[PDB]
Design a protein around this ligand. Structure first.
Ligand code: UMP
Ligand code: UMP
Ligand code: MG
Ligand code: MG
Lengths: 194, 194
C-alpha cells in the first residue's frame, strides 16, 4: 500500500563524476582525462583504460582513496527532492548503493555522507548491496542503464536518472528517464500509485 | 528458478552472544552479567538494562568498540554450511545483516569478516540493511523472531535459527526452526524448490 522508491547514491544523489574528474586532474595533472561531456558508458575505469594503458588503475586509485566518497558534493536539487519525497504520505524511500570492492573507507563514508545531508534518522533507510535486483520496490531511480543480478524479474520499474555517461543513450521504448531532480519526479511516483 | 536464501550474520554465522559476553566480562569484571543460558529476547541491551541501571549503555559500548565485529568467532558449522550451500546448483546465497547505529567500524569489519572466512569473491553476496523485509528471497535464516519493516508481505519464509535468546520460544505453528548448522538445512532448502 505504501509506495516504495529506491534512490541510487552515486550519480543520482552524490556527484561521483565531477568529484572523480576533479580529483583525478589534481592528482595526475600530466595525464589525459575524459571531460564530462565526453563520458560514455557507466564504467569510468574502462573508458580511461581505452584512452591510454595504466589509466584504469590510476582512475581506480582515486575512488579507493580516503575521503573520496565523503567529500562528494550533492547533485543539484537531490537532497531537497529526497527529503520531500520521504515526507510524502504513503511513500517510503530507501537509498540503494553499491560499494566498491575495496571496503576500507567506502561503506563508512557513505553512511557518514547520508548522516551529513539527511540526518541520523535517515541512516535506517540505507541498503548497501552489489545486487539491486534482490531489493523489492515499486521504483528504482538509478543512472546505470544495465541493472542485473540474481533476480531475473525485479519488482521495481527502473527509471534512468540522466548522467553525462548515459545522456545520449536511446532506451528501449517502455523505459523512462528522470532527467534531473528539477524534472517532475512527483509525476513519475504518482504514475505508480493506485 | 534459482532458489535464493538470505543468511543472517550475527547470531547465525558470527557468534555475537559469546563474543559480547566475553568482552563485557573482561571490560567490566565488577558488573553483573547475563549467562548465555539465561539470555531472553533479541535485545541484549534491554536485558542488561533491566538487570541494573547504566548497564544498557555499558553493553552498547562493547559492540561500538573497534574490533568487536571483526573478532567474532564463527558459529560451529556455519562457514562449512554456507560454503556448501552457495556451491549447490540453482542456489544463490546472500548474507543479510543489519549494522548498528554507530557506523565507524561495524560495516567495514563485517566486510572484513566475510572476506576472512569466505574469500574476496563472497563480498558481492553481502546485503547491509536495517530492513530485511525489502530484500526478496525464498528463505531468510535469522535468529531474530520478529522481522518487520516497510514490506508487510515479505517474499521469504523466515526460518528461525536457534540462539540462547530464542531457544525457549514457542512460535506460532506454521513457523519453523533451523536448530544449528548441524541440523538439516538441506531439507529446509529442498522443501522450497519446485
Ligand atoms: O568504473 C567504475 C564506476 C563506478 N564504480 C563503482 C563506484 C561505486 O561504489 C559504484 C556505484 O555506486 P552507486 O551508484 O551504486 O551509489 O560503482 C566502479 O567500481 N567502477
Ligand atoms: O541489543 C542489541 C542486540 C543487537 N544489536 C545489533 C547488533 C547488530 O548490528 C544487529 C544484528 O546484526 P545481524 O544479526 O543482523 O547480523 O543488531 C543491537 O543494536 N542491540
Ligand atoms: Mg549510480
Ligand atoms: Mg542475527
Amino acid at each position: 500500500r505504501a509506495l516504495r522508491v529506491l534512490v541510487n547514491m552515486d550519480g543520482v544523489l552524490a556527484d561521483f563524476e565531477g568529484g572523480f574528474l576533479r580529483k583525478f586532474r589534481a592528482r595526475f595533472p600530466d595525464q589525459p582525462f575524459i571531460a564530462l561531456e565526453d563520458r560514455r558508458g557507466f564504467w569510468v575505469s574502462e573508458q580511461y583504460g581505452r584512452l591510454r594503458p595504466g589509466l584504469s588503475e590510476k582512475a581506480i586509485s582515486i575512488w579507493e582513496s580516503k575521503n573520496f566518497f565523503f567529500e562528494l558534493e550533492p547533485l543539484p536539487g537531490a537532497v531537497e527532492a529526497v527529503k520531500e519525497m520521504a515526507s510524502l504520505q504513503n511513500t517510503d524511500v530507501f537509498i540503494c548503493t553499491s560499494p566498491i570492492k575495496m571496503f576500507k573507507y567506502c561503506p563508512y563514508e557513505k553512511y557518514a555522507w547520508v548522516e551529513k545531508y539527511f540526518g541520523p534518522d535517515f541512516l535506517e533507510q540505507i541498503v548497501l548491496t552489489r545486487d539491486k535486483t534482490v531489493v523489492s520496490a515499486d521504483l528504482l531511480i538509478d543512472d546505470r542503464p544495465d541493472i542485473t543480478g540474481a533476480e531475473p524479474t525485479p519488482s521495481w520499474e527502473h527509471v534512468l536518472f540522466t548522467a553525462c555517461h548515459n545522456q545520449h543513450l536511446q532506451l528501449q521504448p517502455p523505459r523512462r528517464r528522470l532527467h534531473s531532480w528539477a524534472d517532475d519526479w512527483k509525476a513519475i511516483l504518482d504514475s505508480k500509485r493506485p
